[PDB]
Amino acid sequence: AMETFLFTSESVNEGHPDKLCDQISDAVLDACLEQDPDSKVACETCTKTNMVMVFGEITTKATIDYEKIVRDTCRSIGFISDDVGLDADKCKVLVNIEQQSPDIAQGVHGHFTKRPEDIGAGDQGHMFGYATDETPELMPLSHVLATKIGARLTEVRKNGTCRWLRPDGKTQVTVEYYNDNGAMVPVRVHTVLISTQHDETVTNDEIARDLKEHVIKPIIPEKYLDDKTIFHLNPSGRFVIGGPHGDAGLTGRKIIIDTYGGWGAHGGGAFSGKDPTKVDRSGAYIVRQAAKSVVANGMARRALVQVSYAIGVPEPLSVFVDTYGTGLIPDKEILKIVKETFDFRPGMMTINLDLKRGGNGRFQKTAAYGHFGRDDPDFTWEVVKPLKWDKP
Amino acid sequence: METFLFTSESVNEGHPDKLCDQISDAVLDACLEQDPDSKVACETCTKTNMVMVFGEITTKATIDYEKIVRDTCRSIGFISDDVGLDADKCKVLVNIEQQSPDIAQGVHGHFTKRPEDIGAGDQGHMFGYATDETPELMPLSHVLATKIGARLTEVRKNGTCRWLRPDGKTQVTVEYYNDNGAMVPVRVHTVLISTQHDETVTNDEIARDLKEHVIKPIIPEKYLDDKTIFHLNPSGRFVIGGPHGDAGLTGRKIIIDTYGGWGAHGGGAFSGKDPTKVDRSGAYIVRQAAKSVVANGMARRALVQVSYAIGVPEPLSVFVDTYGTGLIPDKEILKIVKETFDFRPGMMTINLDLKRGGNGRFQKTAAYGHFGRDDPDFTWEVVKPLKWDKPQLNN
Ligand SMILES: C[S@@+](CC[C@H](N)C(=O)[O-])C[C@H]1O[C@@H](n2cnc3c(N)ncnc32)[C@H](O)[C@@H]1O
Ligand SMILES: C[S@@+](CC[C@H](N)C(=O)[O-])C[C@H]1O[C@@H](n2cnc3c(N)ncnc32)[C@H](O)[C@@H]1O
Ligand SMILES: [K+]
Ligand SMILES: [K+]
Ligand SMILES: [Mg+2]
Ligand SMILES: [Mg+2]
Ligand SMILES: [Mg+2]
Ligand SMILES: [Mg+2]
């Protein structure tokens, strides 16, 4: 028998209270950038029963309505009554937003005077990019399936297929994998879990039926489902209270759901609410582009890339490439090609990925359903770069 | 000798995110001291002149959340607007409710489920990691960044560097060699420190004092050489700091809390959570498992994943990988792990004594990492003997 192992990833949909915060933070960023592309934004959000607070550091020429951005974001997600766990028109909106520290501003951007090539990293830290040939979008299947199931769970609520749904939901997929000389080859889906908020009109048997038929079966390729696949469907047995009423939310508390579902690696930095001088976001986006380009150019079946920075220093402190033994040329050669092709300086990454463009929900769209593996053209870091190499 | 560069960072107890982790766990400690069965999901945030604690607590404890906040800030050194937050003058906001009854019924039956029947407090997945590259079975990049930050706090509190303020960050790039899947440190390539300071010190003095008093005492001499790069307060001015300089939140340092980018992370934060939250108890048990695999000599490195569904005691999946370093097959290590560790949350809670708080039990975890610590309160660092047939023995 084939040797296999089990790997699990989860997701949450746009109504989860932490994801609500990510989306509000990015809605604030979008609003700032639409009026002032040079906005310095570090917008955190938190939420609990009938309360949202936006807090952090914004230096902008924009005139912003923080309250309206909060209410508008809540409304689009479906938080329009106390019965669904937050009412956009009732909740108290608190604001604690100040200009960026002048001590940070002078060292990072010289108070809006540094040229792009001289812009310092907005902070220290490290960031990883990952790609794998196991799906067409070059993302891990466990992550892709959990994420797409959660997006479908939102879609069947909004389109009237499952009218009993409420906004807050989570998903989890256990994939049975084969290791093919370091490449990951999915075999089957071992376990699928959904926990979704619901109204008082639906039985648990109806929830289970409707989740399997309307949400799971449309998303998981048939070749990965069999009679042994385990289903956990609303295992708590009651999920009527939800949203911020059921669970406090914060920005940047879904960073593995935002990235690779536990595959690759994570350096710890959150994405939402941050302008592109924050290398947590621009640097993670460029190393996704790099890892994805290595795999898409056929140089490897899987790739991991690390970059690291120091506040106020344009050039990265370190870069790493690992192909898990799948590279067709040595990893040191791939590192050389990556370092010749990608400009890791933040002012450069910002321009090369058009990251000062907000509005029409540019960043808000990234703040649910993952930052990576998305074909929307606003996800500029998913565009593959041609790499110069001699295929042996 | 082919090498690669791997970087980890840390922050010390005065970083605004870490201040939030410590407040969250100070709240947990206070609840558990009086009511070991407290249900706690305490989030904290902070910005200029403001701390908010919020979330879900079901406790019999007689608690003043504002006092816990102010005491925790005060103890870290946030005693004035000049250092970035005044523990005694700042606004303290509280938005704390009982746990959802819909969660309470499914997880613990409103305090009626026996330990073996307690459901996971949530879904999710968690990873544990160990590596033989340090005595504490942790990655060197992480250990060095973490210990440098701890020393950065120590030299402020002990009067070695009087110009220091509480908020500081560190970062270490280690040059590594791959020995058949085992990680062998070669040298430290780059060290970075950014620390808050007063107006009395020049950048030359900061660089000197950080190298001589903070870095050289921590990094083994064998890893430093005349090519090691030092970035010391590269921004050039860090006088504003703490919550005044940067908003903080609970659970925004989850890689600093764990393995510094090594191993893997399932995304769940630790601080502010009672042990029915498998984000904390499950991560602690899979650290104990990975550490036990390496400490028993069964592998040089090990990664363990576990996953859960809310309301279900038994995990949905378990994975073991030894990066090609195992001395028995990974499938056999997985079998031994499953036979040795009880992954059910009510069981993990008792086996790791996780309902004991007070005397700073959990607050001590909320800075300087949850793993690789020798304090006996870190019960998940105790190695379990594992039963296996060592290849080098007949018996
Ligand atoms: C289970 S709550 C986390 C722990 C919680 N803070 C506590 O007080 O125990 C985490 C997420 O699970 C979901 N959730 C909320 N209520 C639930 C319920 N009754 N059953 C299942 N999942 C639920 C929501 O997506 C929520 O944001
Ligand atoms: C650089 S701030 C993060 C970005 C910030 N929110 C903004 O508005 O740009 C992150 C951390 O860096 C540190 N920091 C604050 N001010 C700094 C400065 N002037 N120089 C270097 N590091 C600083 C503190 O530890 C702070 O919590
Ligand atoms: K929470
Ligand atoms: K922040
Ligand atoms: Mg959360
Ligand atoms: Mg960071
Ligand atoms: Mg932070
Ligand atoms: Mg979680």
Domain-located, residue A258: no
Q: Whose CA is nearest to atom 20 of ligand 2?
A: B238
Q: Which atom of ligand 1 lies closest to the CA of A234?
A: 21
Q: Are A302 and A182 in contact (CB under 8 A)?
A: yes
Rounded CA gap, A283 and A345, in Å?
9
Nearest CA owner, ligand 2 atom 11 = B246
Count CA within 13 A, CB hemisphere, residue B160: 17
Alpha-carbon distances, residue B129 vs A123, B300, B325 (angstroms): 27, 11, 13
CB contact under 8 A, A46 and B55: no
Atom of ligand 1 minimally distant from the CA of A170: 25
Helical H segments across chain B, by residue range: 16-34, 65-76, 101-108, 140-157, 203-209, 242-245, 278-295, 330-340, 345-351
Adjacent-strand bridge partners of A165: A198
Give the C-alpha separation, B19 to B35, whole Å: 24
- Would A386 be classed as within a structural domain? yes
Q: What is the spatial distance between Cα A16 and Cα B123, in angstroms, rounded to a whole number?
A: 13
Q: Report the alpha-carbon distance of residue A332 to residue A320 in Å, rounded.
A: 9
Q: Rounded to whole angstroms, how far apart are CA atoms A93 and A103? A: 29
Distance A253 CA to ligand 5 centre (A): 6
Number of domains forming the structure of chain A:
3
Residue of A198, A239, A241 with the most ligand 1 atoms within 8 Å of its CB, for mutation: A239
**What chain A residue is nearest to B251 in terms of C-alpha separation?**
A253
Q: Cα(B296)–Cα(B361) distance, rounded to whole angstroms? A: 27
Query: Is the CA virtual torsion B36, B40, B45, B51 positive or negative?
Result: negative
3-class secondary-structure state, position B10: strand
Specify the 3-state DSSP secondary structure of B71: helix
Q: What is the DSSP string of B290-343?
A: HHHHHHTTS-SEEEEEEEE-BT-SS-SEEEEE-TT--SS-HHHHHHHHHHH---
Q: For residues A144 and A152, is the Cβ–Cβ distance under 8 A? A: no
Q: Are A249 and A183 in contact (CB under 8 A)?
A: no
CB atoms within 10 A of CB A68: 12
Cβ burial B29-65 (10 Å sphere, 16+ → b, else e): bbbbbebbebbbbbbbbbbbbbbbbbbbbbbebebeb
My answer on whether A202 and A247 are in the same domain is no
- Chain B residues with beta carbon closer than 8 angstroms to that of A190: 317
Asked if B71 contacts B25 with a C-beta cutoff of 8 angstroms, the reply is no
> DSSP 3-state assignment of B376?
coil
Q: Structure tokens of B95?
A: 């938005």
Rounded distance, CA A146 to CA A256, Å? 12
Let me know the angle formed at the C-alpha of B177 by B175 and B178, rounded to the nearest 5 degrees. 140
Q: What is the DSSP string of B178-232?
A: EETTEEEEEEEEEEEEEEEE-TT--HHHHHHHIIIIIITTTS-GGG--TT-EEEE
Residues A230 and A144 in one domain: yes
Mutate to test the interface with B, among A13, A28, A51, A317 (most CBs of B within 10 A): A317
Nearest residue in chain A measured CA to CA from B142 = A267
Q: Supply φ then ψ for residue B375, to 5 degrees.
A: -65, 130
**Cα A349 from Cα A343, distance rounded (Å):** 6
Residues 6+ apart with CB under 8 A from B334: B318, B319, B320
Token readout for B206 is 């900061």
Q: What is the DSSP letter of B172?
A: E
Residue A171 lies in a domain: yes
Q: Is the CB of A253 under 6 A from ligand 1?
A: no
Would you tell me how many other CB atoms lie within 10 Å of the CB of residue B212? 12
Q: Burial level of B221, CB count in 10 A (0-12/13-18/19+)? A: exposed
Experimental method: X-ray
Number of C-alpha atoms within 13 angstroms, CB side, residue B177?
8
Q: Are the C-beta atoms of residues A64 and A32 closer than 8 Å to each other? A: yes
Q: Are residues A133 and A111 in the same domain?
A: yes
| Inter-chain CB proximity A190 and B106 less than 8 Å | no
Strand order from edge to edge, sheet including B91-97: B91-97, B50-58, B39-47, B248-249
Query: Using an 8 Å Cβ cutoff, are A303 and A291 in contact?
Result: yes
Task: Specify whether A285 is located in the same domain as A332.
Answer: yes
CA distance A353 to chain B (A): 25
For chain B, state the CA radius of gyration: 22
The minimal CB distance from A312 to the residues B123, B235, B246 is found for: B235
Helix (H, G, I), strand (E, B) or coil at B150: helix
- For residue A345, give Cα distances in angstroms to A196, A225, A315, A350, B354: 42, 45, 5, 9, 45
In the 8-state DSSP scheme, what is residue B100? P
Q: Do A291 and A199 have their domain in common?
A: no
Please give the distance, rounded to the nearest whole angstrom, from the Cα atom of residue B111 to the centre of ligand 7: 35
Least Cα distance to B124 among B336, B283, B295, B5 occurs for B283
Same domain, A224 and A163: yes
Please give, one letter per residue, the 3-state secondary structure of chain A. Answer: CCCCEEEEEEEECCCCHHHHHHHHHHHHHHHHHHHCCCCEEEEEEEEECCEEEEEEEEECCCCCCHHHHHHHHHHHHCCEEHHHCEECCCCEEEEEEECCCHHHHHHHHCCCCCCHHHCCECCCEEEEEEEECCCCCCCCHHHHHHHHHHHHHHHHHHCCCCCCEEEEEEEEEEEEEEEECCEEEEEEEEEEEEEEEECCCCCHHHHHHHHHHHHHCCCCCHHHCCCCCEEEECCCCCCCCCHHHHCCEECCCCCCCCCCCCCCCCCCCCCCCECCCCHHHHHHHHHHHHHHHHHHCCCCCEEEEEEEECECCCCCCEEEEECCCCCCCCHHHHHHHHHHHCCCCHHHHHHHCCCCCCCCCCCHHHHCCCCCCCCCCCCHHHCCCCCCCCCC
Same-domain check for residues A156 and A145: yes
How big is chain A, counted in residues?
A: 392
Residues A146 and A133 in one domain: no
Please identify, by atom number, the ligand 2 atom nearest to the C-alpha of residue B237.
Answer: 19
From residue B385, give the alpha-carbon distance in Å to each of B134, B291, B330, B340, B351: 20, 11, 17, 9, 15
Instruction: Phi first, then psi: give them for residue A194, nearest 5 degrees.
Output: -135, 135
B chain contacts of residue A272, beta-carbon cutoff 8 Å: none
Closest Cβ–Cβ partner in A107, A235, A247 for B237:
A107
Q: Is the CB of residue B171 below 6 angstroms from any atom belonging to ligand 2?
A: no
Residue A259 lies in a domain: no
Q: Which residues in chain A touch residue B95, judged by CB atoms under 8 angstroms apart?
A: 48-49, 51, 248
Ligand 1 neighbour B278 (Cβ under 6 A): no
**Cβ(B66) to ligand 2 under 6 A?**
no
Are A381 and A289 found together in one domain?
yes
Answer yes or no: are the C-beta atoms of B271 and B26 closer than 8 Å. no
Residues 6+ apart with CB under 8 A from B204: none
Q: Which residues contact B243 (CB under 8 A, 6 or more apart)?
A: B16, B19, B46, B47, B48, B49, B50, B51, B78, B84, B85
Owner of token pair 């935002």: A258
- Nearest bound ligand to the CA of residue B194: 2
Q: Does residue A318 share a domain with residue A178?
A: no
Q: CA B354, B360, B362, B365 torsion: positive or negative?
A: negative
Q: What is the Cα–Cα distance from B218 to B146, expressed in whole angstroms? A: 10
Shortest CA distance from A232: residue in chain B = B309
Please tell me whether residues A380 and A272 are part of one structural domain. yes
Q: Helices A66-77 and A17-35, interaxial angle, to 10°?
A: 130
Query: Which DSSP letter does residue B273 get?
Result: B
Is B89 assigned a ligand-binding role in the annotation?
Answer: no
CB atoms within 10 A of CB B216: 12
Q: Closest residue (by CA) to atom 12 of ligand 1?
A: B122
Residue B249 CA to ligand 7 centre (angstroms): 7
Determine how many CB atoms are found less than 10 A away from the CB of residue A217.
Answer: 12
CA distance B117 to A316: 50
**Disruptive mutation site among A108, A257, A308 for chain B (greatest number of B CBs within 10 Å):** A308
Asked if A265 lies within 8 A of B269 by C-beta distance, the reply is no
The catalytic residues of A are 16, 18-19, 44, 57, 170, 239, 247-248, 253-254, 274, 278, 280
B56 lines ligand 1 (CB under 6 A): yes
Ligand 8 centroid–CA B106 distance in Å is 17
Measured in angstroms, how far is the CA atom of residue A42 from the centroid of ligand 4?
Answer: 6
From B6, B266, B331, residue closest to A3, measured CB to CB: B331
SS3 B108: helix
Residue A174 structural domain: 2-13+140-241
CATH number of the domain residue B76 falls in: 3.30.300.10
A10 with B267: Cβ contact below 8 A: yes
Q: How far is CA A304 from CA A82, A127, B200, B338, in A?
A: 44, 10, 44, 30
